[PDB]
């Protein structure tokens with residue numbers, strides 16, 4: 196979560212796709228989903244990102260349907276976006292015990308309990324929060340077992356990006372879980 200407003204240059208793929216769905220929240224526009232192997236994924240758009248501008252047009256107060264339209268109407272040699280990095284999210288760092296726990300319970304992405312004397316307790320992890328990312332990798336739409344697998348398989352250090360469930364549930368609505376599971380980019384970023 197960066198306290199900054201970066202700029203990205205997109206470029207439509209061969210099919211006129213950039214691999215993005217946007218959702219209106221509280222009179223801004225925010226990334227609802229990012230397709231793997233897309234211009235959006237390569238330029239490093241993330242779920243949760245705020246789109247402040249598109250081609251120097253402010254997005255204040257747009258509907259979703261309009262932001263999608265805007266993206267169609269555009270000469271895709273170069274589309275230029277202004278992005279505030281995941282405004283609604285925060286990142287916690289944790290360390291595992293000898294027994295390879297960080298110390299919480301979660302369900303459907305949502306942390307539901309913190310365990311006394313855990314690193315999760317020491318670090319102030321909160322319940323009623325949807326897990327968005329682990330060590331920089333989006334996990335949204337995965338199943339809990341797979342998130343466990345990423346956590347079980349992560350180093351001694353774990354890093355989680357969380358979002359308040361109320362806000363999370365309001366972003367993902369109007370989107371069917373299988374799309375989230377199949378299409379939402381869940382890859383380590385390329386370099």
Ligand SMILES: CN(C)C(=O)Cn1cccn1
Nearest residue numbers: 259260261263264265267
């Ligand atoms: C932005 N929306 C809802 C649409 O563009 C729908 N559409 C119909 C034909 C081409 N696009």
